[model samples]
Target: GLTPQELEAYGISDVHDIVYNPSYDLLYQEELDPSLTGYERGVLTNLGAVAVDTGIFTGRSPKDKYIVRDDTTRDTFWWADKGKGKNDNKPLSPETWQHLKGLVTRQLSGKRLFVVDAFCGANPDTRLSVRFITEVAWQAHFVKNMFIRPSDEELAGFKPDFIVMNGAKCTNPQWKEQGLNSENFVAFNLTERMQLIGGTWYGGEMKKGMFSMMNYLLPLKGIASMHCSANVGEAGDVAVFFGLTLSTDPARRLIGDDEHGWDDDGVFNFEGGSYAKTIKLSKEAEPEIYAAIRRDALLENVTKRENGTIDFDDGSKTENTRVSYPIYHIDNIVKPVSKAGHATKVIFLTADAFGVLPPVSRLTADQTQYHFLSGFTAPTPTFSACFGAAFLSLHPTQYAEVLVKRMQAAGAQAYLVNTGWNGTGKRISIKDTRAIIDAILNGSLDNAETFTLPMFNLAIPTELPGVDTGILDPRNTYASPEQWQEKAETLAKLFIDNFDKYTDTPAGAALVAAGPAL
Candidate 1:
């Protein structure tokens, strides 16, 4: 068996040194080559092509850069950072940076908000620790929003407005025992293990409940949420929750036939028909306000089936629906969209290669190790790296355009643009981190609202001696008590910086009164 000390030395502590950069080659490198427009190049990767706001310095629209709003009157409010940056490559313009400084100064100027780091893998502690480090470096911003990484209990407790599960852990036996299966069985997958663990059925049923929570609670109660996961595939996954069946054999009864079919189109099999039906169901089943709004937006609509079985003009199955099943909790799921066309379906396919299954014992005579090693903390890279590697491994973009053309033909609006950032070893400079946090503290908090950031306490590699493994071993896992203290100091520095940088300005004072910026 691997000793705790050895594991600590080898495990998560070395995550930063893994050093993968698939995103640049798959997405940004081409655009940055000067041969293609950034937008054009962005369309080549897994990230869907949407114009990223880059004029923060110009102050043209700062609020739109992020999906937050001022609720003084119920209206969408985008900020303008007149002096921000121009292109993606350039450092944010001094003006924009200053404006960011200004925004940081007044980050807490509005109603209290909550920030949930949904994809907080097994290293939830690390996420929070780093966030605090960032906060300490940037004190001008007040953190009015609570920085929460929802545990299963916390998820149920808050019922967040948005739930983001990037590489999240969904199966928990305790939830099944609590009647979630009977009440919201549709959210579960069909596998016996999943059912036994979660005691739920596969279908769009659970999604309906999710939509209800968003409709009735989030907006009315001022809630917002999001989930990030390989499992949360293309826009359809984002649109509605559909259950999945993994049984390859058609004879399996409970595993049954795959209700969702596969298609030449890149969209996942289950997303095709079931997703449309889920939206349609929500419109019909959801209460009047949400249903009416959804209808108007056409957020839900029937498109081609991912399961190649059904033809567009006429309903026909090319294969057995029995071979297919909805992915997960998406079946009969519901969620509100910010806009009509932003993204109706998003497919987040979790790969088994990420070691999503339970960890195994050591391969050699060495003993198996277990210290909070589950799906999330399995030391996998973010989704971007996964997709990039897959795409490159297949054809190296020789047929990139051809693939895009095919996707377009199959109703894919855009090729993926960019995956999320991979934050290994790329720590924000201590100064930059402090600046961002200070801005949050002074700007977002107020007498009426308390500011909070999700403080994920991560177990990471440290430089302590007494180890035989290499300095950043992937197998060993150890945590240092001093790391937390270091993080706290980082956070405190940010707050102090904000006080020094913006205390006198109007926005600065407002920020101080509020709390911290997110």
Candidate 2:
């Protein structure tokens, strides 16, 4: 499931019973749709989501895919600086290395996608959060996304087209102690990490670590972006960013309203309210970004109250303590900045939201397999398909059909089917099914231009008021099923429209380049 290091960090050994199947898990099912499959399910699923030997992709070892792994037990090394440590990490497995070499040698040779995931090395506390919230937030530089630390001289020959610097828990002290080098790399951190790093860097108070990671990625790119889970709408080209967790939502570690002074007067009664925080926004100094930021910022920082009663007469004192959320974005942290200054593009979308439903389906075992499956199944039936769908706002229905058709054409046993149920039992959307098959067969969708879609996930909502009150009541803060669906649709539309306005093609360089344009 996790790397030996991750296992050790979690105090877990002999993961023989655990597995790395990034296709189904608790995070995805509870937050994203509960009925996803295949590629749609991969991102949400973590390495430990399944039992070691079972699940869809976990059993299929990277024995055929080449990946470099550190063999040295002492001294942490960065991915870029492979030789920094005493011994270079071995490539994936010998077999996987060979297969990957072939793929890279013939198919991916000379291709450049200079993407980097910096700050990949840091570790979090017991909460499993990625934010290095202490004054020593730079400690993250060596952790979560540490591959970029290998000197530029080492990576000079590779000439990647994209680089991603994920600053959640950077742990290597060498890079930070040495400061920035010749390489003009773009960097970003999660919001919680950002708060920790920024506040410490700029001299501010420390808050919750997990919450700060939300802002951790801000400085990495010039353009600021939002991090919400997203999905493709039925229209096929529309991407929706939904399932937003508030920026200021109480962390599992939070217990009281000490930080925001919640015990005072009328504000005390407002404690424990849901979705009541102000949203973060930015007003970039430049004209183009400034205009966009202005429009977006307007929508930030508004709270909405639920239409339920809070009277104590119903013996619902507990319910009375919980308030419904209507307003969001109370702890606004966004500031005007330009990501356009950097040549690299940094977009943040993870499969974690979409990858946790199948096992749940297995757990529920409801006769309507499709119904349960639909909650989490994504762009297709495979991880790659899910990647394709997120990168391009291809309708999940169309994505499944086309991906299956492509796999079948490539001599693989893959078939696409809509997980949703039709009046006549389980049936793929006849319209989407046919169109995808046609595109795949005709070779029109084979080209990268035709197949790629620029999709962004706007799933992270702003902190609601009273979120810092140290309370956890779903009835008080969560969206209803109907509300969730509608919000999902709205978010998907926002992502699609924004992507269309900024990106030429769904997978064009511009879309990817506009990484932090949240």
Candidate 3:
């Protein structure tokens, strides 16, 4: 089943044994080879899912990640805030990238390799033919779980626009000689349209490196690429940052979370799966999650019980333990017939760490652009420019404007919901959370009685079905009205202050007016 010339065409040479575009059965079959050691082969979990460890990295290694700093990227990429935990635009010289890519390439020579051909964007206008060439079977399976799969017709003679040379076990012994920070690196060459992942085996590196490629390459093409979400029943592009509620909503079908693209048609999920956090997930609490992991799911770094069952509470492997399963594995999906569509509602989700924001509030178009740009939350970027600045190829304002234009063109309503705590108070009950989401979908607030918060100027509904009316007004959650006012104003001021950078433009100046009242 291997494509004889696919490897050499992508600049890979001498790959001894090829497992090109292996099917799920074939991939899993290769993974269970008895000759393969524990480090090489994956184990079948109690749930029939494949459980594997990513050698040294249980989480993404962003510190060592690099973007080739060439003429195409040196002036185009956001290079100012790199290494400050602000963005992941760390620049790698062309020479160093060539050096590390050479390492990844050499390690694959004369060895068994796995090549996964997939699509990155669901929309044909934005789609790119991507090839994930891995040294292990499960890594191919991992990309298969994350990227959009191609039909047999599309794959008949697929030519990849981008190729990833994943040297999962490859390391650079002469890293310092190349002026690299570590022996491991996940570097990308945007011009060459290639990714070289050496020193780390985390599949996320490939997934995210591709996401960064979308973030960098798309906006210039007029598609607002982001780390966001949306669904139908779900015209609403949801931000499922919380309990992953919006994703599995039986009523509103999900497209995907993590990576999405907003274009003239509307918003569409870039990937085919949800890379959900595995911590605290349980069969009883999250039956939806358990049901999706049967057979084809890939569980990474999750703690195992003596019986080989999963312990979702154990975070020793890192709180970032995740499970990747294709949307086909989930129940009540959007038919998958057309994963792309128009967005009727845009929800900007945030955590009110200080608990000053209400459970849910309506956002005017200007306010929509403002909060969307703010991406308010607690260490999690009260602002991740366009909700995912790290992956953004362009500036925040550029993406934000494109999103608002799409919203306007589609007549989409926007809302901001606080999934965070209430500041010395409590979190909104999940029951009310679900109820609130239903209201947003049902358009209950469109004609409902409402009051506006002066500080934030957000329209709040007076009541919601099966909801605690007290939480309707964020101020009511506080001890005294004055305390609520002070904190609410404090929070509003933070929004304004954070937006100071964008105020240089007339559009940014206009959006600032839509923020906190003086």
Candidate 4:
């Protein structure tokens, strides 16, 4: 039994309805899977991984996340760009957060609670301590596998900087009245370090919410937080890679593959787990990722065979089907610390669906900042810019400023890699794309000459080892150089126009000069 005084430790004022088990499942007890939870409910994969379909939410419900518009955020947080269905950070009043907090606390009275404690950053100086309380066991495992695990000695007297109360089964009927868009709500009280999520069982909600928290908190403290991955080389070289989708290189030693932070020291990873897409995942090309899904991982919305093998090529449930495992699950993990040096190269990846941009291009500081704001990805833009507008608590310019400043001071090279197509709807082969990436990483393209093509004056390498020199330019394979030019011009206009909103400020306006000249 949890006494009234003890329940507050879990961030609950009082438990009006908890009635399931006598268990006080502390963070320690919740840290392991004693073969208790699954096929605790769904089928277990051949590797003993838990596979469950998260009905209704195979992906995140970005429309429902809210940031409480309180005194703490009124002047600091980005409140103007959100609300009324335009963006993800819909504003919630303090009173509404109060109402929903107690309201959902009522749903817990009749259920068992599993609590897991984890840190969000590998940098001890900046890592965020979080206490995640969930209503589901596998969900607890997901958190345990995703966040930084504190050693027993580190856990002594551990006090969470943030407390996340997740009730996936708890639906809020009064969401409309509370100013939220639906029965689902992922509310954050930034000042309080309290987060609440309901009506969705997607485990990413817990992970991304923490990211959104860091996205807001870090910038305010002068640290640059980014939705990118960082990997270290044997030469002690570090690289920061950004994209609109989850990225992992099978051959690299990835220190952090999801989110990272850059301060005076260097690039530090904020998470200890990798959440990767499982759709069409392959053992041949993605051997590291495919093999990482062994016991202790949680697979969501994936199709499993009768023999318990995962049907990686099948997406019957969701394209965003995913699995998460502790970072140690993958060998060649460079420690999360950045004691060597900051990333000397920053690469921005965009799967340009329009097929107008080069397969790879070098970006000056202004161009990098321009594309960073566009976050341009395809025929239908991800609608969320920066691969992370859904998580930003400040203006995009705030982050863009920090990014360029960091790269410039470090004397790093920035690149724009379009792992997309070439107007004929034909993509640059993964083999070729890998060669381009390898060239960039191994410094093969460092002194290579570049071609500044029209429409978007990006600096494309004239030649690279292991890649076709012809397709380096979009016009190389186009049936009609005319049509390719026309399409390129059209896409450039979109980039130019989309950047208009950002240029209203001096910091944002300065980067436009490096943009495409129509």
> Could you list the CA RMSD of all candidates, in the order they appear?
28.5, 25.7, 3.1, 4.1
Candidate 1 TM-score, true structure as reference: 0.18
Q: How far is candidate 2 from the true structure (C-alpha RMSD, Å)?
A: 25.7
- Angstrom error of the Cα, residue 326, model 2: value is 42
Off by over 4 Å in 1: 1-90, 104-107, 110-119, 124-148, 151-518
In order, candidate lDDTs are: 0.20, 0.21, 0.76, 0.76
What TM-score fits each model? 0.18, 0.17, 0.90, 0.87
lDDT of 3 by residue, 265-381 (tens): 666678877677789888887777778887889888887776778887988778878898887887766655435566766666777778888889987888887887777787333
Q: What is candidate 1's local distance difference test score?
A: 0.20
Which segments of model 2 are wrong by more than 4 Å? Answer: 1-154, 165-398, 415-518
Q: For model 4, how does the per-residue alpha-carbon lDDT over 1-518 read when each residue is reduced to its tens digit?
A: 22445556544554444322212233224434465453335566787776777787888898888888888887777664632123577778888888777756766555556667788887888888887776666777778888887776677757789988887777888877665689988899977789998888888999999998888888778788899878877787788888842235545567788788887777888887889888888788678788888777778889988899778888766799999988877876775442235778888888888888888888878887788888878856553446577788787878887877777778778888888887779876888888888888887676779888776887788888887798788887788778888888888788887877777668668877888877
Candidate 1 lDDT over residue span 57-113, tens digit each: 111111111111123211211112212211111111223222222232233122121
TM-score between candidate 4 and the true structure: 0.87
Candidate order, TM-score descending? 3, 4, 1, 2
lDDT of 4: 0.76
